[PDB]
Structure formats: C-alpha cells, structure tokens
Amino acid sequence: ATDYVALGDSYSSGVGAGSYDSSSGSCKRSTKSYPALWAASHTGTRFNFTACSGARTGDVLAKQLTPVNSGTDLVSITIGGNDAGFADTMTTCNLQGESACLARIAKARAYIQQTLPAQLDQVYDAIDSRAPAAQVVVLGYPRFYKLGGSCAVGLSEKSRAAINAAADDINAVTAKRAADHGFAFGDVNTTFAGHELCSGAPWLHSVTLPVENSYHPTANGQSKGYLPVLNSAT
C-alpha cells in the first residue's frame, strides 16, 4: 500500500473491538479496528495509527496529526462525536431517563449542527495543508438503533430515534464538510443497516461492560461495518 495515517476517536481506534495494542495506552487502538484491519490486509502499509479513544477535533490537532505529511497516501478519520458529547450523552440517557435524555440529545444536536462544522474545518484544513496528495476518507457514525420493533433495551423509542437523528445530523454535517475539502465520505449506514441495536443482529455494543465499549462497534462491526466502507474508497 503505503503511508496510511488513521486519525480520529474511538470509532476509529476500535474501542469495543478488542485486541488492543498495549503501547497505545488509553487510546485503545484495536488490531480489529477498521484501520488496523485495512493495514493488515494491504501489503506494505506504513501504518501510522494515531486515532484515540475520547478524541475531540482539538485532540486530533494536538496529538494526532504528527505523522501526516507530504508522504501520506491515505488518511482516514472519524471525529466529531466527542466534540458533540456523544459518550456523555449516552451515559446521561441511560441513567436519567427519557426527558433528560432528549434534552441532552437536543444539546448535542445543536452542537453538531452549529458548532461542529467549523471544528471539522480546523482538522480538515490541517489535512489539506500537510497531506495534499493523500486520498482522504472521512467515515461517519452509524445510526445506533433500528426503529419500529420491540427491543430489549432501557432507552425509549423516542430516545432511540433522537440518538439516531443526532447520528443523521452528524453524518449530514460531516459528509458536506468532507466534500467541501474534496475528501471522500464513507457512510457506514450502508453496512450497519440491519445491524443497529434492536436489529436482532447488532454490530454495536449496547450499554455494556466494560463501560467504555457501550455504543461502539463490535469486532464484527469493525470488520464488516467500518472496514468495508474504507475499502470502498479503497
């Protein structure tokens, strides 16, 4: 292949997919994450994996862009969820009930729609400058829930739908920002459809243990949800 930098948050590092690289520390970079799977299946990949659990756009700027340079051939990224406080939102939703959940989501969605686009530009501008020849793939987040059926979970239908809408919002904002820098956008709903929570075939962890894994892709989610989307953009 060649010089692949994989940036982003826990959906890119692979929190929830297991088999973590011990040196990544709290970044929780999984060898079963889509970037690690990509590198392991493309011969000769110089794989710079800087994605990190908990990362915001600011963390990408401060800690992750170091190996991004004129030599970079491929950049992947998921980022923006933590900026919008998704982890915090999910936690609140599963503890404080529907009203608090809906309020927290609304606040997150306001962030996504209003505040996030410029922060994405911050990151994408950096990629523009440092790695002008790199093919850049921005991957979205999956809608977390399949709606319409009975589902054995604590979040109400309303809460599920609201969280889905947040995903829809962030994916819309991100696809347009990505395209605005000439980056590819990888919509992971193309693969996660039929594999949301409540789908009967989840490729996401529900609210689970260890706590950090909740709402993140399973190993199957990384290998067949995220990775095929990266591969589709090559």
User: Cα Rg for the chain, rounded, in angstroms?
Assistant: 17
Nearest to 187 by CA among 223, 136, 139, 120: 139
- DSSP characters for 77-135? EE-STTTTTHHHHHHHHHHH-HHHHHHHHHHHHHIIIIIHHHHHHHHHHHHHHH-TT-E
- Structure tokens that stand for 209 in this block: 């243990």
* C-alpha–C-alpha distance, residues 73 and 70, integer Å: 8
Please identify which residue in the block is written with the tokens 């599920």: 160
Q: Does domain 1-234 have CATH number 3.40.50.1110?
A: yes
* C-alpha–C-alpha distance, residues 229 and 234, integer Å: 8
What letter does residue 55 receive in the DSSP assignment? -
- Residues designated as active site: 10, 216
Q: Is 8 left (phi over 0), alpha (psi -120 to 50) or beta?
A: left
Q: Cβ distance 229 to 188 under 8 Å?
A: yes
Residue 40 neighbours by CB distance under 10 Å: 12
- Structure tokens that stand for 86 in this block: 């998704």
* C-alpha–C-alpha distance, residues 161 and 183, integer Å: 29
Please state the φ and ψ torsions of residue 30, each to the nearest 5 degrees: -80, 140
Please identify which residue in the block is written with the tokens 């920002």: 177
Residue 95 neighbours by CB distance under 10 Å: 11
* C-alpha–C-alpha distance, residues 84 and 11, integer Å: 14
Question: Reported resolution in A?
Answer: 1.7
Q: Which residues of 139-165 are buried (b: 16+ CB within 10 A; e: fewer)?
A: bbbbbbbbeeeebeeebebebbbbbbb
- Structure tokens that stand for 181 in this block: 């820098």
- Sheet-wide strand order for 46-49: 46-49, 3-8, 74-78, 135-139, 184-186
Residues in the chain, total: 234
Q: Is 18 left (phi over 0), alpha (psi -120 to 50) or beta?
A: left
Please identify which residue in the block is written with the tokens 């997919």: 17
Q: Which residues of 98-110 are buried (b: 16+ CB within 10 A; e: fewer)?
A: eeebbebbeebbe
Q: Could you tell me the CA-to-CA distances from 67 to 54, 158, 159, 234 in Å, in that order?
A: 19, 42, 39, 20
What SS3 class is residue 39? Answer: helix
Pairing, β 74-78 against β 3-8: parallel
Pairing, β 74-78 against β 46-49: unpaired
